Design a protein around this ligand. Structure first.
Ligand SMILES: [Mg+2]
Ligand SMILES: [Mg+2]
Ligand SMILES: [Mg+2]
Ligand SMILES: [Mg+2]
Ligand SMILES: [Mg+2]
Ligand SMILES: [Mg+2]
Ligand SMILES: [Mg+2]
Ligand SMILES: [Mg+2]
Ligand SMILES: [Mg+2]
Ligand SMILES: [Mg+2]
Ligand SMILES: [Mg+2]
Ligand SMILES: [Mg+2]
Ligand SMILES: [Mg+2]
Ligand SMILES: [Mg+2]
Ligand SMILES: [Mg+2]
Ligand SMILES: [Mg+2]
Ligand SMILES: [Mg+2]
Ligand SMILES: [Mg+2]
Lengths: 116, 271, 65, 65, 88, 100
RNA sequence: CUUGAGUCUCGUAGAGGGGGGUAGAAUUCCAGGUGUAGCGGUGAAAUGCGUAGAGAUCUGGAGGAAUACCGGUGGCGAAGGCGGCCCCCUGGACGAAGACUGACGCUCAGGUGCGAAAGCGUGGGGAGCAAACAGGAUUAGAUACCCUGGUAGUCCACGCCGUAAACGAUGUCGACUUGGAGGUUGUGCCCUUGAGGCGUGGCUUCCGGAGCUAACGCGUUAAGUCGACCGCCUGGGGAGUAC
């Protein structure tokens, strides 16, 4: 539970769910909180408010570390990629940058066929 | 090439032959032969220890230079030859000092090719050199498992081992069975795949083919009596038993490797 | 898209979710979602080409405005 | 206005990364001639030069290496 | 292919002079040189159907020029086919 | 004998060996009457992406006019040599000795 | 004989083809670290994965497939079709100026070759996707759509098939007949007194005149006006089946 200053707030925002894991600058995770664990089961899980709540609930359990400044790594589509940043800053974290880490292939693997 | 025999008679209908027109159509090199008497599968005690062996054609043993420990001296592949002991063909080579030696014939080895061995050799297929001077990822054959041992991996026809990793004293090798094995990097390895890569396409046509290759018939366990085999008995094709070897041990899936002294080398096992 | 941070936050988050559509990522992962068969690729491209040919050079009308 | 046909470079050097960086984005994507003017022949030369510079790592494929 | 030097050598060898480059003998000799050349390319690139299409166009062109030469002057026709190594 | 153009990076610890590398290769090229035109040893450049857990390689550009077997043996040397990283031969069909 | 058709010199553009080698992104798996109760999915769920520690995040390795951006009613190709970069072998097309042969041309029954995808055989390969299959839903039922997995197959080598809404539903070749706006690739000259203006070629996209058409529409790349040769059609089913 040692004190660290430079943490990174990784956000795996997707369509159904969003996952906000806060790691140190090497990738050791401090704490995580998803939209599905904060209540919000089903359609609620996929709203910006659920991601806001998840980012708030992850700004806790990382208080034992004294995190001051944060790198935000938004990864993926979905509504919980611009509300989670606002909720992380409304928690008292000075943001150092915002970086989109969404995996973009270069025509690599073939996607699922299609819904219908 | 792969030649399919014409069905001018049964037992000739289903044959497929591998005619290698580059093999020497003459007597092999004499000073490198020695007699190889058949066994029948019978051990020191006269008893059959491995079944389904006996008969077949006479064949002399060709002294193949598996070690390739004549470093620095170049060699010219004088002749390609048929070996009755291997599935692959052998290659009589002549060194620049006047010494003839049988080697395994890699894929790209025709007559007159210039090979050699040693720490400073090139990376042409057929050139032996310890697996430190060999670049990683390259395709080698006739790999040694101990330095100076002689070479034991990838020496069947069309077979090769691949150098996957290289960690200090050791090298990881994807073997022809998919298993990744660590051998020390002082061990030698000839470059390129082994020749006669179409050997697996012959289909032998008939029973006498296997018979003169030296393979006595295989009686199914069910075709026996309960005293003869764990399978057997039954008033007409009854099995009802779990498949086992003639000595009781499970077959059709039961891992029987118990070495516990070479497990330090097997990074990961057969698929 | 590594938007380093200036002071006022959505003075910079604005240039984050305005650079996201300059790089067009949140709409680039909508083609990569499902596999669109090459016929449909070509057909959608051709229909976008034909739509782009909306004759904006034909807007000299009165319409009593 | 195609500041390549403005000059007649006659071949876009992939070692001129000083001018190649003018035709990528902060994410390293090539910028379309529909924006940069860039007569089509020189746009093709430019894309090949960008790709060779990427291979030689004079330029980045993406901003996430 | 069939570089400027080789085709000019064939022109000088098979024509009235080096300026005479459109005569039937020179056209046929150039097509024959190209065909003998490309035999090696199609020895291993068996699946080069798009290039073999042009090769067969060359073969048919050479045959049409040879028919013209035959029914135009049989002496030149025989001389050219024997000097060039033709007829199967 | 066609006009090539060869850009190859090398490990930034055998940067001391880049002279011997360069003169060795140019001597091999001149041996078959290949003509070196440009020999711009670019020094230690910083890479845009890390090649083999390693930034900051050492570039060498050289424009030659040599036959195919020369350039192919050269490519094999680049491959089997452990310090040469991301070689790149190219056709250029001319004589380019200007800059960069 | 040269106005057709070819050859040669220089040059240009191009995912044209065949072979080989590499690059990066990403998916997946494996080994390890942090960390923890969720993940995943949907219309909603559930199957499913997860405290045996998943998901998330970082490091290392393996492996296969496809090449983001450029990217364009852009290009090339007889059609099928072909897009990371590099090299090797190779086909075609076009332009300017000239010489060269001198009708050597057009078409083509039969024949021959190429011919998407699926499929078949042998041998490899197998990341992802996914017929079949299994389970969960939906349902009146659901051997469907939807979800979770998943095998051939998709990949490679060599053979076989020889078919597609293989389609501009428009055979090839040639000649002639108002125009407009483009795209692309050549080329000549003029003030280049810039990236401009003025012409001349190849391919190409859209609109439209005469004319044609049952109309829709085509409209110098005609479905307009003609010539050559070929293929085909003769009410709808049966049937493109049967033998
Ligand atoms: Mg047996
Ligand atoms: Mg048997
Ligand atoms: Mg039996
Ligand atoms: Mg019995
Ligand atoms: Mg018993
Ligand atoms: Mg009985
Ligand atoms: Mg019975
Ligand atoms: Mg005349
Ligand atoms: Mg016909
Ligand atoms: Mg075929
Ligand atoms: Mg197929
Ligand atoms: Mg198959
Ligand atoms: Mg499914
Ligand atoms: Mg049909
Ligand atoms: Mg089609
Ligand atoms: Mg039709
Ligand atoms: Mg019209
Ligand atoms: Mg039928």
């Amino acid at each position: 539970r040692k004190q660290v200053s430079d943490g990174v707030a990784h956000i795996h925002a997707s369509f159904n769910n969003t996952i906000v894991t806060i790691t140190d600058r090497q990738g050791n995770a401090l704490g995580w909180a998803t939209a599905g664990g904060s209540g919000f089961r089903g359609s609620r899980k996929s709203t910006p408010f659920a991601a806001q709540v998840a980012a708030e609930r992850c700004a806790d359990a990382v208080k034992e570390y004294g995190i001051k400044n944060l790198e935000v790594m938004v990864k993926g589509p979905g509504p919980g990629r611009e509300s989670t940043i606002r909720a992380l800053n409304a928690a008292g974290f000075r943001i150092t940058n915002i970086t989109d880490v969404t995996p973009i292939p270069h025509n690599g693997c073939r996607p699922p066929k299609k819904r219908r | 090439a792969v030649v399919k025999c014409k069905p001018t008679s049964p037992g000739r209908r289903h044959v497929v032959k591998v005619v290698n027109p580059e093999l020497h159509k003459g007597k092999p090199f004499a000073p490198l032969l020695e007699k190889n008497s058949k066994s029948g599968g019978r051990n020191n005690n006269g008893r059959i220890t491995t079944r389904h062996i006996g008969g077949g054609h006479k064949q002399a043993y060709r002294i193949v230079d598996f070690k390739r420990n004549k470093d620095g001296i170049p060699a010219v592949v004088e002749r390609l030859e048929y070996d009755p002991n291997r599935s692959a063909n052998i290659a009589l080579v002549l060194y620049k000092d006047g010494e003839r030696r049988y080697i395994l014939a890699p894929k790209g080895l025709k007559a007159g090719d210039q090979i050699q061995s040693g720490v400073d050799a090139a990376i042409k297929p057929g050139n032996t050199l310890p697996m430190r001077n060999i670049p990683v990822g390259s395709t080698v054959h006739n790999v040694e498992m101990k330095p100076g041992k002689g070479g034991q991996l990838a020496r069947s026809a069309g077979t090769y081992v691949q150098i996957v990793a290289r960690d200090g004293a050791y090298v990881t090798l994807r073997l022809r069975s998919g298993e990744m094995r660590k051998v020390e990097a002082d061990c030698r390895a000839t470059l390129g795949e082994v020749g006669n890569a179409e050997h697996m396409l012959r289909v032998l046509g008939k029973a006498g083919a296997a018979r003169w290759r030296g393979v006595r018939p295989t009686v199914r366990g069910t075709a026996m009596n309960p005293v003869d085999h764990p399978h057997g008995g039954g008033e007409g094709r009854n099995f009802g038993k779990h498949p086992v070897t003639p000595w009781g041990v499970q077959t059709k899936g039961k891992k029987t490797r118990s070495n516990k002294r070479t497990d330090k080398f097997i990074v990961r096992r057969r698929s | 898209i590594k938007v380093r941070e200036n002071e006022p936050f959505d003075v910079a988050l604005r240039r984050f979710k305005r650079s996201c559509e300059k790089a067009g990522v949140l709409a680039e992962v909508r083609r990569r979602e499902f596999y669109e068969k090459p016929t449909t690729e070509r057909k959608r491209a051709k229909a976008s080409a034909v739509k782009r040919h909306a004759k904006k050079l034909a807007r000299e009308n009165a319409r009593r405005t | 206005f195609c500041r390549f046909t403005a000059e007649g470079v006659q071949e876009i050097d992939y070692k001129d990364i000083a001018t190649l960086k003018n035709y990528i984005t902060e994410s390293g994507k090539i910028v379309p001639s529909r924006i940069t003017g860039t007569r089509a022949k020189y746009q093709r030369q430019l894309a090949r030069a960008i790709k060779r510079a990427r291979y030689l790592s004079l330029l980045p494929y993406t901003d996430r290496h | 292919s069939l570089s400027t030097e080789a085709t000019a050598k064939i022109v000088s060898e098979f024509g009235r002079d080096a300026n005479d480059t459109g005569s039937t003998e020179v056209q046929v000799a150039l097509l024959t040189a190209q065909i003998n050349h490309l035999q090696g390319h199609f020895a291993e690139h068996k699946k080069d159907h798009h290039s073999r299409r042009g090769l067969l166009r060359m073969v048919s062109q050479r045959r049409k020029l040879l028919d013209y030469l035959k029914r135009k002057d049989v002496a030149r026709y025989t001389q050219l086919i024997e000097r060039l190594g033709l007829r199967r | 004998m066609r006009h090539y153009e060869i850009v190859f990076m090398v490990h930034p610890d055998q940067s001391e060996q880049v002279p011997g590398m360069i003169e060795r290769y140019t001597a091999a090229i001149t041996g078959a009457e290949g003509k070196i035109h440009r020999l711009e040893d670019w020094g230690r450049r910083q890479l845009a992406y890390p090649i083999n857990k390693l930034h900051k390689a050492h570039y060498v550009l050289m424009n030659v006019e040599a036959p195919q077997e020369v350039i192919d043996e050269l490519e094999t040397t680049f491959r089997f040599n452990d310090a040469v990283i991301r070689s790149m031969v190219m056709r250029t069909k001319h004589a380019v000795t200007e800059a960069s």
